[PDB]
Structures are given as structure tokens and as C-alpha cells.
Design a protein around this nucleic acid. Structure first.
Ligand SMILES: CCN1C[C@H](C)n2c(c(O)c3c(=O)n(Cc4ccc(F)c(Cl)c4)nc(C(=O)NC)c32)C1=O
Ligand SMILES: CCN1C[C@H](C)n2c(c(O)c3c(=O)n(Cc4ccc(F)c(Cl)c4)nc(C(=O)NC)c32)C1=O
Ligand SMILES: [Mg+2]
Ligand SMILES: [Mg+2]
Ligand SMILES: [Mg+2]
Ligand SMILES: [Mg+2]
Ligand SMILES: [Mg+2]
Ligand SMILES: [Mg+2]
Ligand SMILES: [N+]
Ligand SMILES: [N+]
Ligand SMILES: [Zn+2]
Ligand SMILES: [Zn+2]
Lengths: 368, 180, 368, 180
DNA sequence: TGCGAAATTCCATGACA
DNA sequence: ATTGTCATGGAATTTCGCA
DNA sequence: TGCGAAATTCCATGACA
DNA sequence: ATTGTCATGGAATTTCGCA
């Protein structure tokens, strides 16, 4: 403060104030002759209020703030004081964008068997057809085999009606969904428990986690689109056609159709494959087990040069899901409790609840 | 000759009239020859029309090379023949008035009969568990269940409780009451 | 056809049919013993109908189509016949996605002087404030200096009222806009002509072309957001504050505020710069001209490995702007007339109109 | 002493009452001392309130170190003083009852007077062209126009047609009619 | 004529309907 | 007939202060 | 034992509210 | 308490047919 600047004026040395410049008094203010010009050295107990005034002009970050301040002042380690404020500006922390990328995606193992894992999701609303508005899409994780059901609503009640029909064929170990109202209702949870099916949920607002079903939705819409060109969009009657078409389409990387992976033999559909005509069913099922274990598995891609990785105890901010106009895109800071894996974390929010969350919906709070 | 396979032959047939369940009266039974797998569809009538709606659902999952039925009116209709022809399914009729499939069909009737007593009206809801039972039932002749044969894996719902399937004295007495 | 397959059966050589395999007759069909198994060689006049039937199952591309066909058939050069069909499938061509990236962006020269070029654009609708719903944003190209006007509508009439006030200060050579209704009306065009202002329009649905103003919109919303945290969103009264704040904020890359670039001297605003206090205005204006010519200019980035470049005469497809549900995302093919530059082309549409269009809204029609 | 600069001093003053144009009666005149640049704002009244609305617009573009006025009621009000203090603008009053700026102010009056005859009611629409004229007018004393001095460049609207600014015999006769 | 640390520059990231 | 841009904060690089 | 061309594999691009 | 995916069509690479 005014104590320290007394010492400096008479010609003593103070830590941080390079001895080799001329420090003088003028209009009751301590000044210094810097290469850029004369600047005022405010007392230490003045410095916070100065940094704040500068920052608040436009809520600028480090360098834009510094450049204003440096117009009138000099002191030792200005940017340290600049950064200290930026890390305490609530509006900046919750409004500004992140500038660090998530770590590279995981590629989970393919479910080992048909019926180990189902991924499910709604599509719509689409244009009314026969008074239906949505599709329930169910995709078996191992095979890619897909069931399609038209609904009037993305409701539990419709989901239960639909799965009751599908589960006639087989009961799956796990059903994976996103956190849509239909799948998180307790009516659904009961239905699952009744049948020893385990429910697994994606982290919120992260459809990649359900990538298999989401990617099937695309193909479903793409085929429906092609088939409807130049006609009115009456899709209801086409759903079964699309179902059969896709389940019998080859994935060029795998060289198999979902149907093949599910049954080990084509049914009576166009261009059916005849390669196992001479094997017994037992021999056919044996070769199927071999094919199922040796399918291509993609490996996690290289990290971008400016990715960040969650550490326990770190301050991080959840992305706001449906930000209103002129409202921040980020919630208040919170703390990483557990790192489930390099892409998923548990956070304590400030409220403070435990929230399981995708690294893609986080940014690491700047300036510690 | 080639070894027998799934989707080589579906054996179809009707069961009913039954006590109305949710405005349904019949069950279309579809059984794959080779695997013995069963698909059930509730209908309001043994008509070509209801057969066509129901098989339309199934054949959007797998298409048989051949469907086999008796000479039921629903199956001998020219509409049903046009339907099969569209889909490239050859139709096969047994002659009028006369073991894997047959034992299966018998189980289905016997298993329904067992469960539609005390509740002759709640069968519509039961169809899915009926099928799971049928399809995860040990086959005396082959080592495997139908599920096993169709998918090449163990099932998540094994029916270890092979039941009696026979009517107890209570069920016997009050199945005689239901038709009295 | 049946002529060619007669020759082949008796043991002759035909071009494309490798002599070293055994070609036989069975069930009235010519067959061949291939490493994968016996396949039927359909007659040439049969082959189109076969490729079509295969493709139509799910409207599959090259390899997924081929894999079906190869289940039953062999002939010479199957994929040639496959590709020939894919290039004639109207539904595939207008529905499928592109898989080639545009060439790298251009970085146009900064306008040389204030008032050479204005970029203008609307923001909104925002929440009602004082019964206003939009902002007109005007950004001078050389300086970044920005004018903000609240409007009830993104209308010509409001735009004219606003520019009448701004043009009091100075008339610009050119005003650049996007093709919003307000800027393309003839009422506007007249207004421009009256004053010898040239109107320049972006290619449709390509806001990058107006990158300067679009990027200012972001800062405008960002500051408004910070200032409104924890209050109702009453922004009207804040517009002038935001205007002044931004115009006086430093760009760290440039080391100047828009105000500085426009005037060469700070006005009476917080942390005003004092470096030219001892120069005359004439000396100050002279140094300003020097600063204005030596500003950082970014250079066009490296091309992605799978970019494409428009050639005159090439078939290309315009992106559909507001595709309805279950409708293709691409228009019918059209022809490149002129290549204005590597990122902008003139197309003849089929109707056939001339349309000036951004390479980012084109894909090159596949399979020639 | 430092050389004089833009934004060092704004000279403000009112002109009116004028023939009502779009419900406006006055013009607030703002002139930068150093450059001679002019900003005009139409008001309904020479009140502190209208001054405050109008300058609020201007000071959202540039803020003067000092505003200079005569001792008009609008400018000597304590409200206007609080306003200036908020903005860090020092206020300066000439004493009651007594050349760059003065010649400028005179031109403004003379130029208005010329254009508000034959159309004493369409001046609101004309304010923007009035300003462009004033700001792109050659300065006898300095080589440059105000635009040139404020922005350091040539303008896109040069007024090569330095006009008469004097009233012809027609204008003279029918300006005497307008007040008769 | 080289050290440690502070300043400055670099530049990927993301958002402008 | 036209065309991306630039605030941001860690990381990388240069400069400073001192010897 | 090496050539030209056909087949197959590679893989960036983009879209799943 | 959980986790991207995969059809697509030019380009790159391998294999084929023949000698
Ligand atoms: C209400 C519960 N809920 C939450 C959010 C709304 N959500 C739900 C979805 O089914 C989707 C969806 O399919 N896509 C499309 C998309 C985009 C990028 C991708 F990488 C992938 Cl794989 C998919 N996006 C979203 C979303 O999160 N938008 C912001 C989404 C859902 O049901
Ligand atoms: C109706 C005339 N019209 C056409 C389209 C609607 N448009 C107009 C705009 O002002 C914007 C706009 O600001 N952004 C945001 C944006 C997105 C990515 C970027 F790189 C940048 Cl620089 C800006 N997008 C679009 C748009 O084209 N969405 C599909 C847009 C406009 O007025
Ligand atoms: Mg969903
Ligand atoms: Mg989804
Ligand atoms: Mg019968
Ligand atoms: Mg716009
Ligand atoms: Mg815009
Ligand atoms: Mg006066
Ligand atoms: N995994
Ligand atoms: N340029
Ligand atoms: Zn802030
Ligand atoms: Zn197609």
C-alpha cells in the first residue's frame, strides 16, 4: 500500500519493482518512466478495484482487460491480478464458451450375444400418418437387428405395448435408453423388473451414448425419405417394409446383414445367401458363433491437441440443456466426485446433488 | 438332399373360438418346422383378412420358403394365394380329413387350456409368456430348445420349471362348471 | 445376351470371361464354378433388371448392392453396372449425404477504409423489451466499429429508419447483407441507389459470407447475457451500453479497439489511451493511416484430405434450405456455368435459372 | 500545452422553435471544437430531459471531455449536472449575455433557413443531408473538412457544389409571406 | 551470455438463427 | 452475380532483469 | 515375376431432434 | 450411476489373369 510506495520513492529496493527505472511523485501519485511511457503505480489496496473496473467495461478476458489497464497503470505482475478477478466473475464463468475439447471417444465392446443389450429411442414427431406421430425404434446391440413400432406418443404406455410384442420372441438382459420421459417413468421400471430386464440410462442430453440406435434412426429416415419422393408422406404402411429392408442390408465393413448375425441364415428374401446350404443347422450355428466373435472393432481415435481430462476434485461446469434467450449456456461450477471413465464423471452440483454426466457436457472452470 | 433349416417351412393353423379376450377370439399359430419355434397372433376371425394382417407382421421379420396348412377356408382363398405369390412363398396343403410340429401344436392347446381356467378371459395378455415357455422348452428328440436352434445361443429366460401341464382335480371340476 | 453365352458354353473365349474356369448349363441357366461357389451368369439383357432389383431393396450404395447381387450371380465387371444404376437413381442422388468436404475458406482483404464496406444483419426475435423484438446490427468492415438499433420487426421500413440515422455521420460505398426479406426488397434498393450506396448480397443461407457481422452478433449477445444474469431480460435500455462497451474493447490480435481504428484517438471513456497526447492531430492521423495498413491478416487454412473443387460443366446439387420432414435434403442435379472463385459458383438449375451459390451448399453429383 | 483534439470539447446549443416537423420543434446542435464536426438531434423541447435523451445517443458513440454551452435553462439544471458527472464530463458555461465553432453555428442556421422555405415543414427528413453537407464542407482556416479531420480519410460524399447559401429574390419575398 | 520468471505471442475451440 | 471471423485462456516462445 | 486392370479395402464425411 | 456409430463413394492397396 502507501507504506510500500514510500520506501520506493526514496530509492530503496522492493521485491518486484525493477530497481533500474526512475520512480517519481507527481500530482500526489507515484509514477514510473516505462519504455511505453509514464504510468501510475497505484497502491496495492487500490489494485483490485482497478482490475474490476477495467474487466466490467465489456466483461473482457485476460489480454483485453490487461490492455485497458496498461493504458494508465503499471505494477508488478498485473496479469496475476487480472486472472484472479476473471476466476471470480460469476457472469464470465457461466456465459463464456469453453476452448478445450473433450478427450477422444470410447468405443465400447460390442455386446457378445443377441439379446444381451437393446438400445431404444423415439423418432418424431413426423407428419401424421393413420393418426400416428412417432416411431419406437429398438436395436439389438450385437446384431444391429431392428424392430419398428408406430406410436401416437413417445409414452411409457405405448412403449410397454410395443415391448410386450417384441419380448414375445425373447427377453433381453439389458435395455439401454436416453432419459426421455417414457423410459424413466416408474411404470416402465416396474415393467422391466417384472421380467428381470436391467434398465441402463445414457448421461443426459448425450445421444452419442446410444450411438447404435441413433445411427439406425438416420437409415430409417433416409429410406423412408427415398420411398416417399413425389408422394404424400404416408409412412405408417411403409414401416414394416423399412424394417425388413434394413435388417437384410449388408454393412460393407462387416460383410453381414443384421439378419445373418441374428439367425445365421437368410430367410426367403431377395438375393438370399446360399453358402451354407450343405451344412447342417448344427454346423451352421457353429460357424455363426465364429463369425460373431471375429467382427471388426473400431479403436478410439487420436486426442485433439487441446483436450482436457477430468480429475477428481476439479471444478467443472455442466452445460445448460435448453438455455433460454439471453441466458447463460453454463451452470455454476461444481466438483468432480468420481471419474467413472475418461468420458463420464459424477459431479456434486452446489445444491448439492450427484449427477452422472458426459464429459462433452462439461467444461473445466477457467483460472482455477 | 439339403439338411432342413429355419424358414424352410412354417406350419400355420387356427385355434378358437375362444372366450373373448380384449375382443379377440382366435389364435393364429405359426410354427417353424426345423426349429420348432412358435409365433402366436390373436385374431377376431379365422378369415383370410386376419391371416393376412398377422402374417404381414411376421414376414416383416422372416419369410418362409413354404407355408403349410390344412384346407381351412382362410388358407385356400384366392386372396391368400395372391398374397403368398407376391411374397414368393409356395403354399402347401395337407389333404382333407387327415411328429415334431404335431407335438408342439398339442402342447400349445394343452398349455392354453391350462391357463385359461380360473381366468378364461385374460389370455390375450398371456400370449407373450406362452410363447417364451414354448420356445424355451427342452426338445426330447433334439438336445436343444427352439430358441437355441433359431439364434444359436442360450436364452435369458430358461424354463427350468418344466410344469405338469395336466389338469388338477380343482381345475378339472371347475372347467366342467365353466361349460355348465 | 443368349448369343454370347452360347459361344461360352462350347468352350470358346469371350472378352472378360476368364478362360480358366468351368462354365456349364443347369436348369436352363449358364453357371460358373467360382472360388466362392457356383454362381449364375445372367444374359447381358437381363443384367440391368437384376441390379435394379438389388438396389431397390433398401436403396443401397455400391458395396451393399454388390454383396446382394454376388449372392446369386457372377458376370464380368459387376460394379460398373452397379455404379451405372446408382448414378441414375433419382431418390438416392437427392437424399444421400455428401462425403466430400468443401475447399478451404477464403479470407478476403479487410476493407481499406472506414465506410468502404458495411456488413448488416438482424438478431432475434429476442424476448420483448419496451415492445421491441430485434436488433439491427451494422458493422464497418475496416474498423469493426458497430452500430446497434432496436426494432419491432426485421423490416425494410425499420432498416431505412435506422440507416437514415447512421448515414447522418457518413455514407458508405457498399452495404453487404444476407438475403433476408428486409435487404432484398426494392424499397431498400431504391434507398441505396438514391445515395449511391452499392448493395452486395451473400450467397443464400451462408452466414459465413458475412462473418464480421455474424461474429459481432455473438459478442453482442454474450455481453447482453452477462449483464442480464439474475434480472429479467430487459435489454432495450442496455443496447447503447453494449454498443459503447464493444466499440471500446481491444482485440488482442490487433491491439486496437474499433474506436481507435475509426478515430485514431480514444474519447473520454474509462482507461482511455494517452500515447498520442503530444502529437498534433495531423501527426495522429498520419500514424493512424500507418496502423490501418499494417493490421494482421489471416491466411487461408490447409485443405481437408477429401475436399472437392467445382469445375465448369460439372453436375452439382444445391442443398435444400428448409427441408420438410421426410423430404430430401438436396435438390435435383444442376450444372456449373461459371466458377467466380474456388468457393462460389453460378449454377443452371434445370428450371433453368442462374443461381449464385456457395460451395458449402453444394455437393458434386456422385457416379458422374 | 497539448495540441487540441477531437472529443476535447463539444459545443452544444438549441435552435428553435421551428415550424413543427413530425412533432419536433427544436434542433440540438453539437459541434466538436477541434474538428468542427456537427451532430444534429431534433427535440420537442429545449428541456434537460430532451437534451439528456439526445446526448445519451451521441455519448454512446463518443464521450467529450468537456461540454460547453451558454446558460440555457436545459444546461444549467442540476439534473443535467448530475448527468454529466455520471459520465465524467466537465461542464463549461460562457458568461450571460456574451471563431471556428461560431462560423459553423452560423452556417447551420443559414443553411436551415435556406432549406425550410418552400417547405418549412419537411426539415426533420433533411437533417441527415444537412449534416453531411456541414461535415464535408471545405474549411478556409484548415486544409481539411471535418470528416477528414475526424476519420483521417476522404469522404464518399464530397460536396464539390459549395452553394450560395444566400436567399434569392423569390425566397426572400416568400419568406416574408410565410410570416405575414 | 546464461539463468528463472514474467510478458507476450500463438492458436485450437466454439458460436454467430 | 462473389468470398468466415475473432474473443478466449492454457501452452509455447520471447524478452526482461540481473549478473 | 511382372504387367494392366479389376476387386477389395480404406477411411473422411456427415447426420442420427 | 457409465461409454458414438456406420452407409457412403472416391482413392489406395491388393489380387487376379495371363504370360
Ligand atoms: C428428451 C430426452 N432426449 C434428450 C435430447 C433432446 N435428445 C434425445 C434424442 O433422442 C436425441 C437425438 O436423437 N439427437 C440427435 C443427435 C445429435 C448428435 C448425435 F451425435 C447423435 Cl447420435 C444424435 N439429439 C438430441 C439432443 O440432445 N439434442 C440437443 C436428442 C432425447 O430423447
Ligand atoms: C432469412 C435469411 N437468412 C438465412 C439464414 C436463415 N440465416 C440468416 C442469418 O442471419 C443467419 C445466421 O446468423 N446463422 C447463424 C450462423 C451459423 C453458422 C455460421 F458460421 C455463422 Cl457466421 C452464423 N445462421 C443462419 C442459417 O443459414 N441457418 C441455417 C442464418 C438470415 O437472415
Ligand atoms: Mg430420444
Ligand atoms: Mg434420438
Ligand atoms: Mg385348422
Ligand atoms: Mg440474417
Ligand atoms: Mg445472422
Ligand atoms: Mg442557446
Ligand atoms: N466395454
Ligand atoms: N479480396
Ligand atoms: Zn466478467
Ligand atoms: Zn436408390
Amino acid at each position: 500500500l502507501d507504506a510500500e510506495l514510500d520506501q520506493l520513492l526514496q530509492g530503496h529496493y522492493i521485491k518486484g519493482y525493477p530497481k533500474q527505472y526512475t520512480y517519481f511523485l507527481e500530482d500526489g501519485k507515484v509514477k514510473v518512466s516505462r519504455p511505453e511511457g509514464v504510468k501510475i503505480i497505484p497502491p496495492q489496496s487500490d489494485r483490485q478495484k482497478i482490475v474490476l473496473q477495467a474487466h466490467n467495461l465489456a466483461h473482457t478476458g485476460r489480454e483485453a482487460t490487461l490492455l485497458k489497464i496498461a493504458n494508465l497503470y503499471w505494477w508488478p505482475n498485473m496479469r496475476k491480478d487480472v486472472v484472479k478477478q476473471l476466476g471470480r466473475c460469476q457472469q464470465c464463468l457461466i456465459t463464456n464458451a469453453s476452448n478445450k475439447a473433450s478427450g477422444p471417444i470410447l468405443r465400447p465392446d460390442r455386446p457378445q450375444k443377441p439379446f444381451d443389450k437393446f438400445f431404444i429411442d423415439y423418432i418424431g414427431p413426423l407428419p401424421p400418418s393413420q393418426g400416428y406421430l412417432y416411431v419406437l425404434v429398438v436395436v439389438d446391440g450385437m446384431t444391429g437387428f431392428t424392430w419398428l413400432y408406430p406410436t401416437k406418443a413417445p409414452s411409457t404406455s405405448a412403449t410397454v405395448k410395443s415391448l410386450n410384442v417384441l419380448t414375445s420372441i425373447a427377453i433381453p438382459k439389458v435395455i439401454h435408453s436416453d432419459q426421455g420421459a417414457a423410459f424413466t417413468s416408474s411404470t416402465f421400471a416396474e415393467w422391466a423388473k417384472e421380467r428381470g430386464i436391467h434398465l441402463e440410462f445414457s448421461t443426459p442430453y448425450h445421444p452419442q451414448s446410444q450411438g447404435k440406435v441413433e445411427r439406425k434412426n438416420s437409415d430409417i429416415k433416409r429410406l423412408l425419405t427415398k420411398l416417399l419422393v413425389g408422394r404424400p408422406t404416408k409412412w405408417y404402411d411403409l414401416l414394416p417394409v423399412v424394417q425388413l429392408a434394413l435388417n437384410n442390408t449388408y454393412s460393407p465393413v462387416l460383410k453381414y446383414t443384421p439378419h445373418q448375425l441374428l439367425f445365421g441364415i437368410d430367410s426367403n428374401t431377395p438375393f438370399a445367401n446360399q453358402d451354407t446350404l450343405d451344412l447342417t443347422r448344427e454346423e451352421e450355428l457353429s460357424l455363426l458363433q465364429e463369425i460373431r466373435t471375429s467382427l471388426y472393432h473400431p479403436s478410439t481415435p487420436p486426442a485433439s491437441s487441446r483436450s482436457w481430462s477430468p480429475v477428481v476434485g476439479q471444478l467443472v461446469q455442466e452445460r445448460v440443456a435448453r438455455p433460454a434467450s439471453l441466458r447463460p449456456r453454463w451452470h455454476k461450477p461444481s466438483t468432480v466426485l468420481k471419474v467413472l471413465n475418461p468420458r463420464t464423471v459424477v459431479i456434486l452440483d452446489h445444491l448439492g446433488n450427484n449427477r452422472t454426466v458426459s464429459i462433452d457436457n462439461l467444461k473445466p472452470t477457467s483460472h482455477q | 438332399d439339403r439338411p432342413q433349416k429355419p424358414f424352410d417351412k412354417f406350419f400355420i393353423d387356427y385355434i378358437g373360438p375362444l372366450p373373448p379376450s380384449q375382443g379377440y377370439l382366435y389364435v393364429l399359430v405359426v410354427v417353424d418346422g426345423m426349429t420348432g419355434f412358435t409365433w402366436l397372433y390373436p385374431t377376431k376371425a379365422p378369415s383370410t383378412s386376419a391371416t393376412v394382417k398377422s402374417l404381414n407382421v411376421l414376414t416383416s421379420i422372416a419369410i418362409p420358403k413354404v407355408i403349410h396348412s390344412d384346407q381351412g377356408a382362410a388358407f385356400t382363398s384366392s386372396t391368400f394365394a395372391e398374397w403368398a405369390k407376391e411374397r414368393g412363398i409356395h403354399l402347401e396343403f395337407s389333404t382333407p380329413y387327415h411328429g415334431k410340429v404335431e407335438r408342439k401344436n398339442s402342447d400349445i392347446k394343452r398349455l392354453l387350456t391350462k391357463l385359461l381356467v380360473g381366468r378364461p378371459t385374460k389370455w390375450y395378455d398371456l400370449l407373450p409368456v406362452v410363447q417364451l415357455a414354448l420356445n424355451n422348452t427342452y426338445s426330447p428328440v433334439l438336445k436343444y430348445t427352439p430358441h437355441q436352434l433359431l439364434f444359436g445361443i442360450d436364452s435369458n429366460t430358461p424354463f427350468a420349471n418344466q410344469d405338469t401341464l395336466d389338469l388338477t382335480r380343482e381345475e378339472e371340476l371347475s372347467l366342467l362348471q365353466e361349460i355348465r
